Amino acid sequence: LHKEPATLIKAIDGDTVKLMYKGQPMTFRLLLVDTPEFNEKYGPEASAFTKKMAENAKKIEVEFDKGQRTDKYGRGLAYIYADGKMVNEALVRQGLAKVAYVYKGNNTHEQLLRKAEAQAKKEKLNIWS
Template sequence: MEEEPKDQRLEQDAYGNEEISDRLEVTVAEFIDGDTTRFNYNGSNESFRYLMIDTPETKHSRHGEEPYGHEASERTEELLSNAEKIEIEFDVGPKQDDYDRYLVYVYADGEMVNEILVREGLAEVKYVNPPNDTYVDILKNAQQEAQAANLGIWSEDD
């Protein structure tokens, strides 16, 4: 059986080093919340959870809407709606979680949405499960910047 061709190309990582990218282009099927989106993938509508981040809840059965949950959801929708190209990238570990959601890094026009949400104080680094932790240092640095600037969930007035 032949393996499907991958969308491989040379990219630059955050440090300017060239690397091969295995990103796959997708389209949005439905916005769920800040860290979960349904994408059209392999011919069907599938749920995707953004790796290593957690945004405040908007529709939680017990907690209801948490502070900054609405802002995180709106920001994710804005980034993806305005993107000409949306891509996903799997890490080297399990591709799905216990809820059958695909685990990915999401890119809007080449910029990692996971990192943008953390850097803007709309998500925290959470659920770091090796080996799905390739970009943990990038995300932790973004979180330190958001905390130092008291942005969003890290603001002092909450």
């Protein structure tokens, strides 16, 4: 897998961000994770976490997996990095997302995220509290 440059246009919620990628705007949906919706418990905290992570970053990168790069709603599917730190993994490690939507062929970072979920759960963090 390879990291590609992109720039934040706007944070949207816990697991979706609008980025400029190859000079076109697109909504990216974070691979392998599921945050609460804004109206649900921890929804606002997941949104605020992803917003601060993305907005604070000097450099945002997108990393596609081996499989489909857009979903059925035309959203990009990627691992997103903020100054080298994976947002997907970070949300999970904080108990602000569950591992979810694991489809064959786009699952390269599954065990890494599962490892992070295990530790958030062990710590009784947020969603796991």
